[PDB]
Paper text:
The starting point of the engineering efforts reported here is a Kemp eliminase we previously obtained through minimalist design on a β-lactamase background. Our design took advantage of the conformational flexibility of an ancestral β-lactamase scaffold to produce both a suitable cavity and a catalytic base within it through a single mutation, while a second mutation enhanced relevant interactions at the de novo active site. Kemp elimination is a straightforward proton–abstraction reaction that can be performed by a simple molecular machinery consisting, at the bare minimum, of a catalytic base. FuncLib does not per se predict mutations that enhance catalysis, but rather suggests variants with multiple mutations that generate stabilizing interacting networks at the active site, thus focusing the search to safe regions of the sequence space.
Finally, we have used X-ray crystallography to determine the 3D-structures of the catalytically optimized GNCA4-2, GNCA4-12 and GNCA4-19 variants, the first of which has a transition state analogue bound at the de novo active site. The short extrapolation leads to a catalytic efficiency and a turnover number of about 2 × 104 M–1 s–1 and 102 s–1. These values are well within the ranges of catalytic parameters for modern natural enzymes and, in particular, the value 102 s–1 for kcat is about one order of magnitude higher than the median value of the kcat distribution for modern enzymes. To assess this, we also performed EVB simulations on the variants for which crystal structures were available: GNCA-2, GNCA-12 and GNCA-19.
Author numbering:
A (entry chain C): 27 to 58, 60 to 238, 240 to 252, 254 to 294
B (entry chain A), C (entry chain B): 27 to 58, 60 to 238, 240 to 252, 254 to 295
Write the structure that this text describes.
């Protein structure tokens, strides 16, 4: 396969370990490069976090309008949205929007205790047939991305399959599926990653992840024109190139994937 | 409200952080002073622990007559009932009664074991719509009550609303609801707190909490004569006065809330 | 009871603490020697781990054919099967077979991950009415078997009753019940323990456990000829004799139990 050889070369240039999974729901075709290896998910877990909250909203156990207040001691790093509402708090819906579109870390911590902690998120994932993904820690510790540590990891194939189930399955109500899609489409953190390499007329929703040990992740749902959605999970870790080059690797994966798919047609 | 100002002055005299929530089920009237701030709940969680046990009994995954045995090495501090039954053990019902009416710490640990741990209690609370309260540790570490630590915390408003759903809603069976009510009414540890400030003809059940960093708590269900229950959750932490004065702060909160309620009518 | 006196003297020969539980499903008779006390499970938990995985297969949330891959660095000690499939991985069914019949430790960790962790296994046991057994750690730490540590423990009576409900109750589908039975019957690690002392015409399935502090365990389901199943949970810890002599204690428990049952019938 030419795409696998292309990704192996791109992986070698990055100096780290690269994981790619593609799921085309029009064809059923799947592609994987290290698709069944574990990678630190980092903030890419926040897409699953909002899904578990929306499921509880569907169950009548949670309300998007419920207001959550907090103090300045509850703020952790990379919280550009929650740092502004120490005085008035934020609603659950506003916290999910901040956690997805701005990768707000404190918002994720507040939503995690709304669920009951990382084990509750893992249990929700087990409840929908994801027997692979696991969340173990809170922010910011879940971003350590140490080699050999299975904590807070997923595989590209499992993540892509889980999002297909979340966005297109019967797990969430039609209202919450659309809300999760709307949040991912409105992401502001991934202009340099998968979105950069995708054709401009593609409708894209995505959630990014960044961690230590040169970790750069991006997960997307892609709607080509008059085309069923394509799910894409890219994970890069242990890489030796700088932050901008790691983003370009993700963008390069997008270009390689699209160019592999123009051959299938 | 004059009550908010009165509690502000009482909070000032306490030197700490005071949290108050009132839930009046006869009218629907609610009141809160820092009702949405997190407080170390300490032993007040044992009311929710017993409810989670009773829910599993209603579930017939648990039996109130089931006997649990333990050794002296399993005893933690302040366990006045469980320390007397190292030889013969205690039933689940006896452990719940000991955990509520005497705030027995080892009894709480054994019941947490019967649940499957603090995360199992949190999961039960999430199953009944409490998205705020969390238990994270066992006895006695859950009582460290460090400022800024969200572990083992609740808010006054959440605890009052959860106590209401457990005692009035249909989370528990009628028999289980009456049993939890009976345990709370039979409490022996809270005579100097909310009970002290309430009118004598009030039917009251309560659960106390005490911890480090000058922490003194009390949650209660109060039935005035010919009156639907009123749920009351009071949390004091970081206070700078001794334990006797902290109990007096809780008793004064009951006096102020009652005085505010009678002024609401006459 | 003579069997109680006999187990008492045998316990003292072992130099440690001995726990025995018998559950005869033909008559309902149950026997216990320290059947209420907690013992470190060690690998005996893997029988419950496979049941929890089989329950999810019944629910359609897991597939026995699902392949799991792992790396060289993921292997822990005592992993005779998993160490040969770093390249090709293994299916869930293959991991359950290795975890049960060879007591493979890495296979158990991979299956614990498929569940969501030790707390997920404990939650499954609470869901079927086992309010006693708890798993807290992963391999190999769960085999520490420190005296007084309630982590990763069960009681003989709870394990026998749980094994009974898993193999004969409505928890699992008949297909997964038969699969769990077939795995236990195919165990390769218990020839020197309970199986050694049982009559040769008995059909036996078992799961062994071994840990530090001289811990030697074995749980079994025993089919005598034309007789309903008998469940037997034997736990030994803090033993002062070597590994072979600890194995011989378990075999002697089987001999003592069978002889006592011979007296029950005649
Ligand atoms: Na004892």
């Amino acid at each position: 396969a030419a795409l696998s050889e292309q990704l192996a070369e791109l992986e070698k240039r990055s100096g780290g370990r690269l994981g790619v999974a593609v799921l085309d729901t029009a064809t059923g075709r799947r592609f994987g490069y290290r698709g069944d290896e574990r990678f630190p998910m980092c903030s890419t877990f926040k897409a699953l976090l909002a899904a578990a909250v929306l499921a509880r909203v569907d169950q009548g156990k949670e309300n998007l309008d419920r207001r959550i207040t907090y103090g300045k001691e509850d703020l952790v790093d990379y919280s550009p949205v929650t740092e502004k509402h120490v005085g008035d708090g934020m609603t659950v819906a506003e916290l999910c929007e901040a956690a997805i579109t701005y990768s707000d870390n404190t918002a994720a911590n507040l939503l995690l205790e709304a669920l009951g902690g990382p084990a509750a998120l893992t249990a929700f994932l087990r409840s929908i047939g994801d027997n692979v993904t696991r969340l173990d820690r809170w922010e910011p510790e879940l971003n350590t991305a140490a080699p050999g540590d299975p904590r807070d990891t997923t595989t590209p194939a499992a993540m892509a399959a889980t999002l297909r189930t979340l966005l297109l399955g019967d797990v969430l109500s039609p209202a919450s599926r659309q809300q999760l899609v709307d949040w991912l489409i409105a992401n502001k953190t991934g202009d340099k990653r998968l979105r950069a390499g995708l054709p401009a007329d593609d409708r894209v929703g995505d959630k990014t992840g960044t961690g230590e040990h040169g970790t750069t992740n991006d997960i997307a749902v892609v709607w080509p024109p008059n085309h069923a959605p394509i799910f894409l999970a890219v994970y890069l870790t242990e890489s030796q190139v700088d932050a901008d080059a790691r983003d370009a690797v993700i963008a390069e994966v997008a270009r390689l994937v699209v160019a592999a798919w123009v051959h299938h047609h």
